[PDB]
Each structure stands twice: as C-alpha cells, then as structure tokens.
C-alpha cells in the first residue's frame, strides 16, 4: 500500500495473507468470506506467461496477523478469466481444508447484494484497501488506505488496456490532494466499503491490476465482486 498508514488492531479481520510455501514470501492478499471460504484474484494463482500455475500444496494462508495458518483443499479459478489481454474476470475461490475458528482477529466480510450496489457503487464514494504489499514502487503492520471510486469513462481514458464491466477503478485524480494506491503484494486483497444501511462492511472489489503504483493519471483496477456474485454462489451451490 502506497501512501497509506498503519492500521488499527483488528481493522480488517477478514484479511488473509497468501504465502508461497517455499521459499516463503507474501504473494498476494486475500479475504475471508465465510468460516471456510477465501476470496482472491485469479492471477495470484494462474498467470502462464510468468510460468505460474499454483496447486493447493504450493501455498499457505495466513489469518489474523492470534494468527491461524491454514492449508487449502481446492482452488477454483473462473473459467473465463482472461490473462492474455486485460485480466478480465480476475477472481478465484480458495477452500480451506477445514473451517476456521472465528475470533476478535478472525471474522468474515459480506458479499454485496443488488440493493447494496445501487447504494454504494458511485463515483466519489470512498472504499477501503488493505494489505502488506510494498510501500513504494515492506510494511511492519497491516496498511490501510481510503480511495474514492472513479467514473467509468475516466478509468477507460487512463489506460490503453480494454476495460470490461467486470472491473472498476479507484483512486485520486492528479492534484486532488490525497494520494494512495495498492502495490506489489496487495494484489488479490479486498476493496471494502461500509454500508450505512446495516453498519456492516461489504467487499466490493478485489485488487486486480494497475500500471505501476500511485502514479498521476493512473488508477488501480479492481475486480467487480457483485457482478461476479452468481459465479461465487455457483461454485458453493
């Protein structure tokens, strides 16, 4: 997280760390959506150009820092995830070997419903990004940054990559004052928003991709969780 700050203790209990088993290194952030399931970006597991095709025994999760390390049972990547062009449908589900014990430091986040959209996915409206990724282009504590959702045309015009409805972008425009972005190591983590309706946190996005970290005229692109809710529900049935 670039231009973020140290998070308070227990600020994001749904925070999951995706670690490489050997040699151990933080690969990606992820999120806790139930006592059993973890949500992350597809490209954190599957990106053929860089020779990347992670199995269940290549990785270990980290939850709560109180910290409960876990092995996964089954990985599910979207069948129409497009790594060739634009990272369309950059989404993947992790099933933990067994249910995790909830605590003051371990607690799942909510997936948005149609009403929660309508109400929150608007330009100017701020969301929360969190991770242990790089501060520039390593943190001691979990990092938090608040970044406003950006208009769809402004996202399209900020890049040459083809943007699909299955993605959205967020961040500040050049000379808006505040800065901030995700960076290498935050990818696959949650973009969360708080609902004024029920006082609950909802994950609207998955940190997907960007050109660099916290550059002017550029924005971080996030997977549209709600728009891929059907698929998330389908693999759990």
């Amino acid at each position: 997280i670039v231009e973020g700050q140290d998070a308070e203790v227990g600020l994001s209990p749904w925070q999951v760390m995706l670690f490489r088993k050997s040699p151990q290194e933080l690969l990606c952030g992820a999120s806790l959506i139930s006592d059993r399931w973890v949500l992350t970006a597809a490209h954190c597991l599957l990106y053929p150009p860089w020779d990347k095709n992670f199995t269940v025994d290549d990785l270990l999760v980290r939850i709560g820092k109180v910290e409960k390390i876990s092995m996964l049972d089954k990985i599910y990547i979207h069948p129409r995830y497009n790594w060739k062009e634009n990272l369309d449908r950059d989404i993947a589900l992790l099933k933990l070997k067994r249910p995790i014990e909830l605590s003051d430091y371990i607690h799942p986040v909510c997936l948005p419903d149609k009403q929660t959209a309508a109400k929150l996915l608007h330009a100017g409206f701020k969301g929360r990004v969190t991770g242990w990724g790089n501060r520039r282009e390593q943190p001691s504590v979990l990092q938090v940054v608040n970044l406003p959702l950006v208009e769809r045309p402004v996202c399209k015009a900020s890049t040459r990559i083809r943007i699909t409805d299955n993605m959205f972008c967020a961040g500040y425009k050049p000379g808006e004052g505040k800065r901030g972005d995700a960076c290498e190591g935050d990818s696959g983590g949650p973009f969360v928003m708080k609902s004024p309706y029920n006082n609950r946190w909802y994950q609207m996005g998955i940190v997907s991709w960007g050109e660099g970290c916290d550059r002017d005229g550029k924005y971080g692109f996030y997977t549209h969780v709600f728009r891929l809710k059907k698929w998330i529900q389908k693999v759990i049935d």
Binding site: Q5, G10, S34, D104, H107, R128, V144, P148, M193, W201
Partner: peptide, 29 residues
C-alpha cells in the same frame, strides 16, 4: 454469513476506527 461485516473489535464494541468518518463523509457529495 449472519454475523458478517461486524468487526469484533469495532462494530461489536461501538468503537469506530480512525478513518471511518472519512468514508461516510464522501457519501454526502
């Protein structure tokens, strides 16, 4: 999840984190 969204150290304690006001504020223009 029936209890999702509510943080044990925050929403369960009616304590609000240091940058919460920042978020809700953006909602009103």
């Amino acid at each position: 999840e029936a209890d999702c969204g509510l943080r044990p150290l925050f929403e369960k304690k009616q304590v609000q984190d240091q940058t919460e006001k920042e978020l809700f504020e953006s909602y009103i223009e």
